[PDB]
Design a protein around this nucleic acid. Structure first.
Lengths: 38, 176, 141, 556
RNA sequence: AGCCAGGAUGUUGGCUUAGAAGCAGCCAUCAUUUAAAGAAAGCGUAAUAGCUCACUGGUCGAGUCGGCCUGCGCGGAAGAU
C-alpha cells in the first residue's frame, strides 16, 4: 500500500471505504492504484 | 428500506428457538445459532420472519440489516449446503482427503497436514480439485481462505491455489 | 436473427482467397474450417469483376455449425468506385470535386432494393448525399 | 523419481502432439518415492534395484499384487502390436495361439526398419533404477550395422545406380568424416566411424569429393577422454582418422579403385553474428589467424569478415555457442577478446541544418598574422545518385580565393566529412556548400583556410543533429502458435516494417523489414519470446535510419 | 442497484490503407429503424475474436441522485532520563 496525503479517485472502478479510519482506495485489477493516508 | 422490504420465509424442516436475543436454529444437519446485538426486534410472525430496529440504536437498520441477510443464509445452509471447490495449479501439487484431514503438497521440505474443524465434510475428486461442504457461510470460506493464503495466485505464471470461480490476472515477463 | 453469441458483418474484396489477418478473427470465433468459407462463396464470385469490398455477415449455431448471409456491395464504395479514387475524404467541407446525379444513386439502390429490406431508396438518398459531403464531393441533377 | 512424473500421460501425449503411435513396454511400480519396480511386460517381470548402492541387484520377480489388473489391460495391447505389424500374427491374436516373449519381438524388430512405433521405458538414471534394464532392448530393438542397409555408394555423375555394398570385411574400405575436433598435439583430429571393411596402419586415404591426397597416421581411440592408440581398425569401431591435410563435412575416407560417395546434405546457416575485437595490437596478429583451427572444426561457426573495417565479425547459430568459442580462446588459445558490435554502415546523416558556421582562424604562422575567417553553409545530405561522398560546392564570392588556396578549405571540410563527432562515424554522402572564403596575400596559405574549415564543419554538426544512415534487412520469423502477437508487438518496438502475417500447415510465418542497426541482441530476445521455437531466414532489401539525436548533449 | 438482456446494424469509416479495420492520431461528426444503439470510453490487442458503457427493451415495484453553502469531526500529526 503506497502512502501519500492525497487519496484521489484515480482508476475508473475505484472503491472507497473507510477501514479503521484511514482511507484506502480499492481498485479491481490494478494494484498500483491503491493509496493509504489522508 | 430495501432490507425493510426484505422479510425471510422459514420453511418446514428448520426450527427456531426464540429466547429473545439468543436464537438457536435447529436445522437439518446442524445448529446455526447467532447471538445478535440488541439493535434488533425479532419475531417469527406467522411463517415469514419479520424483524425490527430497536429505538436508541437507530443505526440498527445496519445492525439488523446484517441479520436479515444472516438468517436467510442459515436456514438454507444447514439443509442444502455450499459447494466450495478450489483449483490447485502447482507443479507436482496434489490433494487427497482422509477423515477430516487435507494434505498439502506445497513445494516444501516437509509435509503440511492440517486438521479441519466441525462443520466440514471435505472431499477430493482429484489431486487438483477439492470439495468443501459446510453449513455456515462463514466457515465455508474461513477454512478455504487459509489454504489459499498459503500459496497465493502468482501473477507471472498463474501458479498458486485459487478458487473455482476466481479468475487471476497473470502478467508477462517483458524484460528477460 | 440470433443473439449475444455472435453477429459481425465483415468481408472485404473476394478476389483474395486467404482470410486477411484482421478479417481472420471474425472467422476465428466459433471454430470454422476456413476452407469451407472459401468454398461456399466462390460458386457465385465468378459472376463479378473483382476489386470492390463485398460484405457478408457471420451467424452461428450450437455444435460446430455456422451460417452467413450474402448481400450486394454497399453504395459507400460504389461512390468511390466510379469516382476513380478509393479515398477522397481529406477535407469534407473544403473540397468541391466530382459530380454524380441521383440517377446513378437509385440504380445502385435497386440492387439494394433487390437484396435488402433496409437501406431503402429515398431514405439513403441523403446519406448517399451524406457520404459525398464528407469526402468533399459535389452533386447536381 | 520426481513429482508430476506420470509415465502413462507422456507416452499417451505423443499420440496428441507428436501424432505418432507409441506402444510402451516397461511400465511403473511405486508412487515415485518408494519406487522399486519397472514393469517389463513381455516377460511380465518386475525388477528389484539397489537399496541405494551404485549397482548391486537385478532381482526379477512376478508382477506385484498392487498392479495385477493394470498389467492385464496393458499386456493385451502389447500383443495387439504384432497382429497389425505383420499380417501373419493377425490370425493368432484371434485364434489364441500363445504370444510368447520371443515370438512377438520377431515381428516388432521389423517394425523398427520402417519406424512407426517407438519403444519407451521409464526409470531413473541417477537413482540407478532402469539403467541395467535399458541395455537388453538395444540388442533387440535398435538396429545393428549388419542388419541395416549398409554403405550405399552411388557413382559420380554417369548414372544413378545406388549399390548396396556389404556390411562385412569382404568389401572395399569405406568411412565418413565427422566430429572433427582439434588438439595442440597433432593439430586436427576426428571422431570418425567406419561402417565396414578393415584398414591397416598407414594408408593413402583420400577425400574423394574434393580431390586431395592425405596419408593415414597413428590412429587413437578414447574413453571419450584418454589417448589409446588404435592400430588395427576393425569394421565398426569409432576412432580418430588422424593426419588429414584437408577434410570437410561428411566426405569419404576411401582407398582408390573403390566405390565413392559424394554427399553433403543440409549445410546449416549460423545466424547470430557478433564481431570480436582484439585487446592489444599484438593480439590481432594472433586473432587474425584464430579462424584457422577454429572454423576448420565445424560448420556451425562462421566469420562474416568485412571488406573495409577489417574487424573479425563472427557468425553463430546460437550466442550460447558464441559464448563458448570465446571461452575456447581464453585459457588454452590464450586470447583476451573484447567482444563488441558488428560492422553496421554508420554513415552520420543530418536531421537539422546549420545556417552559417565561420571557422575562426587567426595566427602569425608565416611572419605576418596568417588569417582565414572562412564560413561554410551546412547543405542537406546529397540524396539520390551521388557516387562521390564528398560534394564540396565551393561557392567563392566572385572567385575571390585563388586556385592555389582552393585545396586548403577543401582539405579541412573533407577531413571532418570522413570523421564523426560521435564515435568517428563518417558524415559521407553529405553535400556541403562554401558560404564565403576570406582571401588575403601575406595572410593567405593552406593552413589559413584548412584549419578554419575543419572547426567550421564540426561546429555545424553540434547544431545539426547528425543521425545515422542505416542498412535495413529483410527479416523473416517462423513461429507456430498464436504467440507471435507478442512478438510482432515487441517487433514494433524495433521498427520492424511489417509486410504480412501468413500461415503454413504448422507455422505462422511473419514477414517484416528490420533495421540492421537494430539487430543488437535480436537472437537472444526472440529466443525469450519464441522460447527458442523458431526456424527462419535472413536476407536484405532496403536502407533507412535509426534515431540518435546525440548532437543535443552527448556529442561534445 | 442486480439476474434474464439485445449490445438493432449501413462501414472497410478514410487518410497513408503495411494494421494505423468504432479501440494510434487529425478533419467530418450522416445516419438507412429510431419502444434499444454512438461514424464511439477502456480493457482483449499488430488487427480483431472475449468483456461493457451506451437505452436498461422486459422484471422488482418504492424513493433516489450529483453538486453549492454552513455546524462540527478523521486523516495530514515523527524525537530525544
Amino acid at each position: 500500500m503506497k502512502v501519500r496525503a492525497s487519496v484521489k479517485k484515480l482508476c475508473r472502478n475505484c472503491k472507497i471505504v473507510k477501514r479503521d479510519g484511514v482511507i484506502r482506495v480499492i481498485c479491481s485489477a490494478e494494484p498500483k492504484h491503491k493509496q493509504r493516508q489522508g | 428500506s430495501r432490507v425493510a422490504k426484505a422479510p425471510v420465509v422459514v420453511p418446514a424442516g428448520v426450527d427456531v428457538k426464540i429466547n429473545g436475543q439468543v436464537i438457536t436454529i435447529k436445522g437439518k444437519n446442524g445448529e446455526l445459532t447467532r447471538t445478535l446485538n440488541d439493535a434488533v426486534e425479532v419475531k417469527h410472525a406467522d411463517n415469514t420472519l419479520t424483524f425490527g430496529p430497536r429505538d436508541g440504536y437507530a443505526d440498527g437498520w445496519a445492525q439488523a440489516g446484517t441479520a436479515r441477510a444472516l438468517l436467510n443464509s442459515m436456514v438454507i445452509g444447514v439443509t442444502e449446503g455450499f459447494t466450495k471447490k478450489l483449483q490447485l495449479v502447482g507443479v507436482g501439487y496434489r490433494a487427497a482427503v482422509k477423515g477430516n484431514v487435507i494434505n498439502l503438497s506445497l513445494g516444501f521440505s516437509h509435509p503440511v497436514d492440517h486438521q479441519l474443524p466441525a462443520g466440514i465434510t471435505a472431499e477430493c475428486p482429484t489431486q487438483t480439485e477439492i470439495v468443501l461442504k459446510g453449513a455456515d457461510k462463514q466457515v465455508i470460506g474461513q477454512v478455504a481462505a487459509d489454504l489459499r493464503a498459503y500459496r497465493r495466485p502468482e501473477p507471472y505464471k498463474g501458479k498458486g491455489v485459487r478458487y473455482a470461480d476466481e479468475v487471476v490476472r497473470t502478467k508477462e515477463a517483458k524484460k528477460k | 436473427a440470433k443473439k449475444v453469441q455472435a453477429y459481425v458483418k465483415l468481408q472485404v474484396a473476394a478476389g483474395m482467397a486467404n482470410p486477411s489477418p484482421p478479417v481472420g478473427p471474425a472467422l476465428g470465433q466459433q471454430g470454422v474450417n476456413i476452407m469451407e468459407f472459401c468454398k461456399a462463396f466462390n460458386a457465385k464470385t465468378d459472376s463479378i469483376e473483382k476489386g470492390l469490398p463485398i460484405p457478408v455477415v457471420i451467424t452461428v449455431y450450437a455444435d460446430r455449425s455456422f451460417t452467413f448471409v450474402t448481400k450486394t456491395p454497399p453504395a459507400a464504395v460504389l461512390l468511390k468506385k466510379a469516382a476513380g479514387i478509393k479515398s477522397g475524404s481529406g477535407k469534407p467541407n473544403k473540397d468541391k470535386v466530382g459530380k454524380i446525379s441521383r440517377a446513378q444513386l437509385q440504380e445502385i439502390a435497386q440492387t439494394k432494393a433487390a437484396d435488402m429490406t433496409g437501406a431503402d431508396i429515398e431514405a439513403m438518398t441523403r446519406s448517399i448525399e451524406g457520404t459525398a459531403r464528407s469526402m468533399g464531393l459535389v452533386v447536381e441533377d | 523419481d520426481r513429482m508430476g512424473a506420470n509415465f502413462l500421460k507422456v507416452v499417451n501425449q505423443i499420440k496428441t502432439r507428436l501424432g505418432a503411435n507409441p506402444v510402451p513396454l516397461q511400465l511403473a511400480i511405486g508412487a515415485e518415492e518408494h519406487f522399486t519396480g519397472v514393469v517389463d511386460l513381455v516377460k511380465m517381470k518386475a525388477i528389484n534395484w539397489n537399496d541405494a548402492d551404485q549397482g548391486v541387484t537385478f532381482e526379477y520377480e512376478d508382477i506385484p499384487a498392487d498392479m495385477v489388473e493394470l498389467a492385464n489391460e496393458w499386456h493385451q495391447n502389447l500383443i495387439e502390436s504384432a497382429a497389425e505389424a505383420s499380417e501373419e500374427l493377425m490370425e493368432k491374436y484371434l485364434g489364441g495361439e500363445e504370444l510368447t516373449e520371443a515370438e512377438i519381438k520377431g515381428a516388432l524388430r521389423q517394425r523398427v526398419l520402417n519406424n512407426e512405433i517407438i519403444l519407451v521405458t521409464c526409470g531413473s538414471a541417477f537413482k540407478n533404477k532402469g539403467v541395467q534394464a535399458m541395455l537388453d532392448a538395444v540388442i533387440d530393438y535398435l538396429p545393428s550395422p549388419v542388419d541395416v542397409p549398409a554403405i550405399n555408394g552411388i557413382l559420380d555423375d554417369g548414372k544413378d545406380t545406388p549399390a548396396e555394398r556389404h556390411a562385412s570385411d569382404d568389401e572395399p574400405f569405406s568411412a565418413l568424416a565427422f566430429k572433427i575436433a582439434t588438439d595442440p598435439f597433432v593439430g586436427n583430429l576426428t571422431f570418425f566411424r567406419v561402417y565396414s571393411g578393415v584398414v591397416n596402419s598407414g594408408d593413402t586415404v583420400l577425400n574423394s569429393v574434393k580431390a586431395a591426397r592425405e596419408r593415414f597416421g597413428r590412429i587413437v581411440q578414447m574413453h571419450a577422454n584418454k589417448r589409446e592408440e588404435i592400430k588395427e581398425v576393425r569394421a565398426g569401431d569409432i576412432a580418430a582418422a588422424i593426419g588429414l591435410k584437408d577434410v570437410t563435412t561428411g566426405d569419404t575416407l576411401c582407398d582408390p579403385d573403390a566405390p565413392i560417395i559424394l554427399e553433403r546434405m543440409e549445410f546449416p546457416e549460423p545466424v547470430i553474428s557478433i564481431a570480436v575485437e582484439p585487446k592489444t595490437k599484438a593480439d590481432q596478429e594472433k586473432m587474425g589467424l584464430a579462424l584457422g583451427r577454429l572454423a576448420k572444426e565445424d560448420p556451425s561457426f562462421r566469420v562474416w569478415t568485412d571488406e573495409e573495417s577489417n574487424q573479425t565479425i563472427i557468425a553463430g547459430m546460437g550466442e550460447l555457442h558464441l559464448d563458448i568459442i570465446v571461452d575456447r580462446m581464453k585459457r588454452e588459445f590464450n586470447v583476451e577478446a573484447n567482444v563488441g558490435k558488428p560492422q553496421v554502415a554508420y554513415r552520420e546523416t543530418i536531421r537539422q541544418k546549420v545556417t552559417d558556421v565561420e571557422g575562426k582562424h587567426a595566427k602569425q604562422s608565416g611572419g605576418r598574422g596568417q588569417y582565414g575567417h572562412v564560413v561554410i553553409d551546412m547543405y542537406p545530405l546529397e540524396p539520390g545518385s551521388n557516387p562521390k561522398g564528398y560534394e564540396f560546392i565551393n561557392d567563392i564570392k566572385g572567385g575571390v580565393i585563388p586556385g592555389e588556396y582552393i585545396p586548403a578549405v577543401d582539405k579541412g571540410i573533407q577531413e571532418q566529412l570522413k570523421a564523426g563527432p560521435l564515435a568517428g562515424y563518417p558524415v559521407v554522402d553529405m553535400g556541403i556548400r562554401l558560404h564565403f572564403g576570406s582571401y588575403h596575400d601575406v595572410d593567405s596559405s593552406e593552413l589559413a583556410f584548412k584549419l578554419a574549415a575543419s572547426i567550421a564543419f564540426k561546429e555545424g554538426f553540434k547544431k545539426a543533429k547528425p543521425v545515422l544512415l542505416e542498412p535495413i534487412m529483410k527479416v523473416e520469423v517462423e513461429t507456430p502458435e498464436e504467440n507471435t502477437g507478442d512478438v510482432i508487438g515487441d517487433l514494433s518496438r524495433r521498427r520492424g516494417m511489417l509486410k504480412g502475417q501468413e500461415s503454413e500447415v504448422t507455422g505462422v510465418k511473419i514477414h517484416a523489414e528490420v533495421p540492421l542497426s537494430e539487430m543488437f541482441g535480436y537472437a537472444t530476445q526472440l529466443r525469450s519470446l519464441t522460447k527458442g521455437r523458431a526456424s527462419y531466414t535472413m536476407e536484405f532489401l532496403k536502407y533507412d535510419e535509426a534515431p540518435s539525436n546525440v548532437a543535443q548533449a552527448v556529442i561534445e
